């Protein structure tokens, strides 16, 4: 079974997995740095605005 869906505040960092796909270090809304977790990109639901903000212009 999946972990629960939690609300995202922002993306803190990113890295490639062994298969060449992004993982994102997530700042969870209502939490701080202590609670950040690395999540594969396929865990993200409609989070393109957070990815685009992180990557910048």
């Amino acid at each position: 079974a999946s972990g629960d869906l939690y609300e995202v505040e922002r993306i803190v960092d990113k890295r490639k997995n062994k298969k060449g796909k992004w993982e994102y270090l997530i700042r969870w809304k209502g939490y701080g740095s202590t609670e950040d977790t690395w999540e594969p990109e396929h865990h993200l639901l409609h989070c393109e605005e957070f990815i685009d903000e992180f990557n910048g212009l």
């Binding site: 972990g3 869906l5 939690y6 609300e7 995202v8 969870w28 999540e39 409609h46 989070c47």
Partner: peptide, 5 residues
């Protein structure tokens, strides 16, 4: 939202 593992 995202799945938190």
């Amino acid at each position: 939202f995202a799945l938190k593992s």
